[PDB]
Design a protein around this ligand. Structure first.
Ligand SMILES: Nc1ncnc2c1ncn2[C@@H]1O[C@H](COP(=O)(O)OP(=O)(O)O)[C@@H](O)[C@H]1O
Ligand SMILES: OC[C@H]1O[C@H](O)[C@H](O)[C@@H](O)[C@H]1O
Ligand SMILES: [Mg+2]
Length: 337
């Protein structure tokens, strides 16, 4: 049996597709996997000689395809339970991918080293399932460590563990919203960023200057100016956190949210409602997490106060919107084990 965590991004959003900085954490809500390929998906109540079908099994088929293309000698396997909500923005995708991968890693004794576990799970999701996405999710879910977040330079895969204060909790709030446009909006942001680097002669958003941004056209400059600003915030969250100044960390997430919401235009009414309400109830800061357009948000909150805050925002939110929102008081966790 294998426990694969989900994940949350502390700071550094829409940054990995230009090879900038990122600071995920694995969280303590999991996927749990228990001759041919025949699996029971407990959530769905349901299913080597490798076609896409249009169903969830496609994540399973993409990992075996990716191990085989790489030459590993594996076989089949014969149940999936879990805490983790699907489609919430807590990357059940990556949890499931690398949970499957590590079952094979353990059984068929592949002794695959961690960073390849992540790069392998991400190729399965990019090439097999049709879904674009940097290394954020797979890395977090594999490299998570107990009382830590992971600073990652995604250009160079150079990472650093930074203790997250034990008397501070990350409040995860799932809005219940998954907008249908989210997918093509992600790809547009991504298309536009790729183009910007290309116009500028640059290879990463770490390199980009004030005079560089002046050379981009209106929308490209609006979108890329945000990324250059996040990169800087990540570095500032990095120092703040290593001094245990969680109030500075919190102020920075807050700035980040409104830069995301106004400029990169990937927030929505209900993420903003959560952030606004978190701040009326004493949070250090709060901010959407993941792609945007719905999904989940985080608030930094004292541990002793977290359930009272969450319950307050939940009821406040459920009076305003009809979606099935949930929240979780979450602990930074170990990656796949
Ligand atoms: N426990 C699971 N059992 C079966 N399928 C799963 C499981 N976890 C994730 N999945 C599959 O992965 C998808 C997760 O979707 P995704 O678009 O990446 O949203 P999220 O960001 O939460 O991962 C689900 O739709 C489902 O097809
Ligand atoms: O930072 C936002 C985030 O959006 C999605 O979650 C992708 O899977 C990530 O790679 C990253 O781009
Ligand atoms: Mg996902």
């Amino acid at each position: 049996t294998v426990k694969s965590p989900g994940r949350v991004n502390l700071i550094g959003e829409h940054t990995d597709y230009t090879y900038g900085y990122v600071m995920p954490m694995a969280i303590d809500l999991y996927t749990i996997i228990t001759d041919k390929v025949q699996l029971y998906s407990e959530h769905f109540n349901e299913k080597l000689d490798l076609t896409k079908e249009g169903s969830w099994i496609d994540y399973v088929k993409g990992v075996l395809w990716v191990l085989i293309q790489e030459g590993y000698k594996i076989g089949g396997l014969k149940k999936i339970t879990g805490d983790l909500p699907l489609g919430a923005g807590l990357s059940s995708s990556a949890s499931f991918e690398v949970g499957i991968l590590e079952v094979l890693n353990q059984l068929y004794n592949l002794n695959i080293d961690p960073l390849k576990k992540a790069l392998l799970a991400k190729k399965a999701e990019n090439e097999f399932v049709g879904v674009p996405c940097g290394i954020l999710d797979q890395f977090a879910v594999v490299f998570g460590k107990k009382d830590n977040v992971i600073f990652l330079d995604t250009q160079t895969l150079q990472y650093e563990y930074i203790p997250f204060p034990k008397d501070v909790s990350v409040l995860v709030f799932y809005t219940g919203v998954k907008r249908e446009l989210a997918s093509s909006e992600y790809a547009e942001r991504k298309r536009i960023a790729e183009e910007s680097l290309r116009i500028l002669g640059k290879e990463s958003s770490k390199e980009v200057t004030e005079k560089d941004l002046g050379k981009l056209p209106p929308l490209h400059r609006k979108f890329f100016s945000y990324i250059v600003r996040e990169n800087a915030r990540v570095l500032e969250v990095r120092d703040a956190l290593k001094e245990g100044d969680i109030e500075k960390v919190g102020k920075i997430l807050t700035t980040a949210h409104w830069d995301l919401a106004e400029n990169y235009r990937v927030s929505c009414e209900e993420l903003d409602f959560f952030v606004k309400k978190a701040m009326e109830l004493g949070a250090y800061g709060a901010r959407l997490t993941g792609a945007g357009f719905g999904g989940s948000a985080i608030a930094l909150v004292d541990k002793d106060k977290a359930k009272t805050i969450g319950d307050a925002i939940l009821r406040e939110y459920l009076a305003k919107f009809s979606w099935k929102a949930k929240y979780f008081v979450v602990k930074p966790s170990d990656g796949v084990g």
